[PDB]
Amino acid sequence: RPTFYRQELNKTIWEVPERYQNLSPVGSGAYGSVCAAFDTKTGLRVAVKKLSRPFQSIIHAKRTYRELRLLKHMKHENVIGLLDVFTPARSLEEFNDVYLVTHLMGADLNNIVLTDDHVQFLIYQILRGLKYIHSADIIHRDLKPSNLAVNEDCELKILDFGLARHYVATRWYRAPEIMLNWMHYNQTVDIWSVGCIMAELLTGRTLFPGTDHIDQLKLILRLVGTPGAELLKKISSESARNYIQSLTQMPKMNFANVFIGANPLAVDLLEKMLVLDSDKRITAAQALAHAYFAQYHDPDDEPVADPYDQSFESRDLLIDEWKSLTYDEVISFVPPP
Numbered sequence: 001r002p003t004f005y006r007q008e009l010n011k012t013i014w015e016v017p018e019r020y021q022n023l024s025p026v027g028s029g030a031y032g033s034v035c036a037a038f039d040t041k042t043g044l045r046v047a048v049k050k051l052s053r054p055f056q057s058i059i060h061a062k063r064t065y066r067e068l069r070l071l072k073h074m075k076h077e078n079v080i081g082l083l084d085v086f087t088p089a090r091s092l093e094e095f096n097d098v099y100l101v102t103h104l105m106g107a108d109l110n111n112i113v114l115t116d117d118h119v120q121f122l123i124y125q126i127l128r129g130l131k132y133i134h135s136a137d138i139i140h141r142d143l144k145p146s147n148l149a150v151n152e153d154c155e156l157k158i159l160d161f162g163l164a165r166h167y168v169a170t171r172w173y174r175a176p177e178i179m180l181n182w183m184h185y186n187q188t189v190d191i192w193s194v195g196c197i198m199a200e201l202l203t204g205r206t207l208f209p210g211t212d213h214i215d216q217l218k219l220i221l222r223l224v225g226t227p228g229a230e231l232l233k234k235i236s237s238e239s240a241r242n243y244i245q246s247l248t249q250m251p252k253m254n255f256a257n258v259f260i261g262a263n264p265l266a267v268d269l270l271e272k273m274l275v276l277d278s279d280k281r282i283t284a285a286q287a288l289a290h291a292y293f294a295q296y297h298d299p300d301d302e303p304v305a306d307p308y309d310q311s312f313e314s315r316d317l318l319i320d321e322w323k324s325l326t327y328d329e330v331i332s333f334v335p336p337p
């Protein structure tokens with residue numbers, strides 16, 4: 001039973017425990033908003049995410065539940081972890097609000113903008129966290145520089161703000177198979193994104209700054225070329241395949257000529273990540289074993305996730321039921337050691 005306080009920031013009432021103080025707005029979108037706070041029970045600086053009308057729809061109530069489940073599951077140095085989760089409501093019937101708390105880590109990756117050595121370490125930690133996440137049958141799906149928390153010492157956490165924002169456009173970092181619904185995507189959609197980030201850290205430019213999905217694809221195929229017969233027949237979507245079949249043929253660009261003056265090991269890795277056929281794209285675990293990361297690679301300290309129960313994903317429930325599952329998850333939360 002902590003003593004909560006009401007307070008209003010920017011738009012909305014935040015009712016949170018007394019321990020958290022000096023809430024400062026950092027982010028708002030359709031799905032919620034984040035503040036920095038000080039936590040007086042630890043002395044450390046936190047992010048406090050308040051979801052907005054968590055249970056306003058089915059899709060929202062499940063999204064809410066999902067986030068709570070994911071964040072509770074994540075126990076990795078290179079991925080966001082849950083310090084606290086709370087609600088004012090002292091009953092399920094009262095429960096309308098969910099606040100998530102985490103260890104604030106400072107800038108994100110585009111604000112933190114870099115030696116080639118920095119690039120290795122950062123891209124190494126991305127892949128390290130990604131190997132973990134992928135090990136739980138989780139696809140991040142929105143991996144861009146704003147969803148990477150980096151501190152003073154270039155230590156990195158993967159997160160997802162997931163606020164619905166309106167600027168780092170998620171399409172800039174999206175693999176074309178998930179962007180244009182070519183086919184049944186896999187986890188390597190995240191590898192593509194890491195490729196774009198890596199590129200960007202090295203050149204300072206966004207790799208593919210497309211203005212929409214059509215421009216996006218244009219820009220992509222300029223570099224990687226248009227798909228051949230082989231990949232074309234993997235685009236199981238006919239409308240998507242017909243569109244591709246109609247584009248002007250583009251040759252793959254030799255990346256050594258594109259990423260001029262880059263560690264040739266970084267170029268080679270790029271080539272392996274920025275593969276259009278996700279059947280051929282390097283994976284997280286494999287990429288960690290690349291020579292680009294020799295200074296960091298340690299197969300003995302590149303850990304995998306405990307088993308993540310996503311049976312719920314196959315459920316069609318009512319708002320009230322998603323809301324009760326969420327509630328259960330809040331009460332069963334036990335903090336960090």
Ligand SMILES: CC(C)(C)c1c/c(=N\C(=O)Nc2cccc(Cl)c2Cl)n(-c2cccc(CC(N)=O)c2)[nH]1
Binds near residue numbers: 034047048070071101
């Ligand atoms: C990296 C990983 C595990 C895929 C992840 C972290 C996360 N949530 C956050 O990272 N939230 C967050 C971000 C910044 C500050 C604070 Cl306090 C939080 Cl709780 N995720 C997340 C964010 C929003 C919604 C969902 C659920 C969904 N995808 O429908 C998950 N996803």
